[PDB]
Amino acid sequence: YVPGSVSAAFVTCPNEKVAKEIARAVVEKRLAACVNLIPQITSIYEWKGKIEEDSEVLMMIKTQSSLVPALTDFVRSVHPYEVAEVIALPVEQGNFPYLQWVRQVTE
Amino acid sequence: YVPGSVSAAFVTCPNEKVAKEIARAVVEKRLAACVNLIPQITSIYEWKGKIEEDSEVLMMIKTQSSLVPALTDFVRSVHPYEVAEVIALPVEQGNFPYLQWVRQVTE
Amino acid sequence: YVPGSVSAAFVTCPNEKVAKEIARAVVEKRLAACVNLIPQITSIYEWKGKIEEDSEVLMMIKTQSSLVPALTDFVRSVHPYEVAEVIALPVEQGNFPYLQWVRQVTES
Amino acid sequence: YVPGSVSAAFVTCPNEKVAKEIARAVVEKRLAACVNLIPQITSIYEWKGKIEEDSEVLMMIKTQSSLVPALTDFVRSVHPYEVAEVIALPVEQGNFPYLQWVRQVTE
Amino acid sequence: YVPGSVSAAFVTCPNEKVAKEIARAVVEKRLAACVNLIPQITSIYEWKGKIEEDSEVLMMIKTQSSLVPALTDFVRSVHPYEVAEVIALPVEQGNFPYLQWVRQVTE
Amino acid sequence: YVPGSVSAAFVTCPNEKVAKEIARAVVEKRLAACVNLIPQITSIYEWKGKIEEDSEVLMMIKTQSSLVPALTDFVRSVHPYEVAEVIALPVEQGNFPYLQWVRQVTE
Ligand code: NA
Ligand code: NA
Ligand code: NA
């Protein structure tokens, strides 16, 4: 296993419906090995002077690091927001079989 | 985009009220671009020889990596706990406009 | 603090019961300083032709990076799934006292 | 000190004269704090399936990681080779004063 | 470019002849894009209780990070020393064309 | 092998005499497994707004990453310059036996 060659990408969505549709798509298109959805999220950010709170859903998408650009482009079309949160974190170590599986199902 | 110049910091809180107070403060103080709150967390650790379980709330704070020390100091200063969990994970890749936005709103 | 010498490892479980059992074990065995359990997770993956959805629980395990191989072996052994998700993400910066604590409670 | 916010960039040159010109330029332009020149290098690469050996000089350029794109653009512009070797390696730890100095003289 | 997907590997050799043989081989076998040889090295380490000084030559081998294990195997197998120094350092940023070239000639 | 748990630290010295003295000391004190000296270096930096060129020697010091702070403290203490260049680069991959050896001889 090459350190950081698999990544865990985080994507924020407005609701569960959208998150599922994106999640299903990225897997079906082989852009990700799998996705975890974390619901009941409260996002806190500053907008036009004031601080806003919204209900959101968070995706943890596990994929090859080489696919992150392609994953990001896809998430950009489908347009959850004008500017979509996509951040990829590199996996330094882990369960080799599983890490090999994430590669095998995205080649 | 410089790899790892934006970070995702994780902070554990005793409840939603405290997590929201801290979240609103770090954004208002420009120490973070935004905060995701993940509720209904069960924390499992050892204390006085026994293994404890607590209800907690988890913050995923997205900010510049250069601000993490300042972020930590602030959280230290206001957090209820004697020793606050603050761990920062570097963002290797992502949506450039979003990554640019995180920098823009924290300069 | 040496950058990346503490890691946050993520492990997916079928349910709360199993997640708690594994969480308690890794702490008791000093393989992790602490574990956060994130419930009500929906996992989306391909199940041999179909796209599947399951209810799962997610563990965020905080430990020394040197212990991740030992943590994985243990999880491997007692995990239901044939192939367990264990992914470790390195902590670049943080609260030094806390980072020191994670090391203190996992030394042997 | 933020890990990896200073980098050590390596640049290959055909000879000492060119390396010095580039080295002096990047420092005068504040794109680097300083440059170490390693002479008497033998470079070994293929080209049309045949293996070449050339005399080269290697630069180790120490600078902010945020300046690496700007550094690379400049080196592209003045380097005799069509495709210039510029590779940046991040500095995880070091002498803080010196790391602080590299930042101070490139701001 | 995926951060850290190209590496610069350093290998220590007893002399120029050996270093060149190994260098030519790894390039010919497509295990590396190119190799820089840094001569006139003095190595300082402890041997049988006393501190030794040897004349050595240092290789900086630029290749895909995915190839480092294969590179190491080859070197370990051919290298004079029982335990060969092979250390790989990841390239976080650089000249994209050149980084693309390193991949192209090693696929 | 834990990625980045061994580091290659670079230290600049005014001449070979000093470099050898420091190199011998860090090895004898178990702060490093071994040191490569790269001589005939030309350093280019700015000083009182004027660009200087000096003859220097470069050390590549291979050690545990956990020891880098202790290594730096020692170097700062024996090093002639007021502000010593010490930069540590993490080793992501390599020859495991050798990586194991660097740890063995510095425990
Ligand atoms: Na990597
Ligand atoms: Na030639
Ligand atoms: Na590390």
UniProtKB/Swiss-Prot annotation, chains A, B, D, E, F:
Post-translational modification: O-glycosylated.
GO cellular component: extracellular exosome; membrane; mitochondrion
Keyword Hydrolase: no
Cysteines paired by S-S bonds: none
One biological process term in Gene Ontology: response to metal ion
Molecular function per GO: copper ion binding; enzyme binding
Domain of life: Eukaryota
Tissue: Ubiquitous. Widely expressed in brain.
Keywords of this entry: Glycoprotein, Signal
Family that this chain belongs to: Belongs to the CutA family.
Function: May form part of a complex of membrane proteins attached to acetylcholinesterase (AChE).
Subunit-structure text: Homotrimer.
Protein name: Protein CutA
Organism: Homo sapiens (Human)
Portion of the full-length sequence here: 63 to 169 of 179
Curated annotation (Swiss-Prot), chain C:
GO BP terms in the entry: protein localization; response to metal ion
Keyword Oxidoreductase: no
GO molecular function: copper ion binding; enzyme binding
Gene Ontology CC terms: extracellular exosome; membrane; mitochondrion
Keywords assigned: Glycoprotein, Signal
Tissue-specificity statement: Ubiquitous. Widely expressed in brain.
The organism's place on the tree of life at top rank: Eukaryota
PTM text: O-glycosylated.
Family of the protein in this entry: Belongs to the CutA family.
Role this protein plays: May form part of a complex of membrane proteins attached to acetylcholinesterase (AChE).
Subunit organization: Homotrimer.
Protein name: Protein CutA
Annotated source species: Homo sapiens
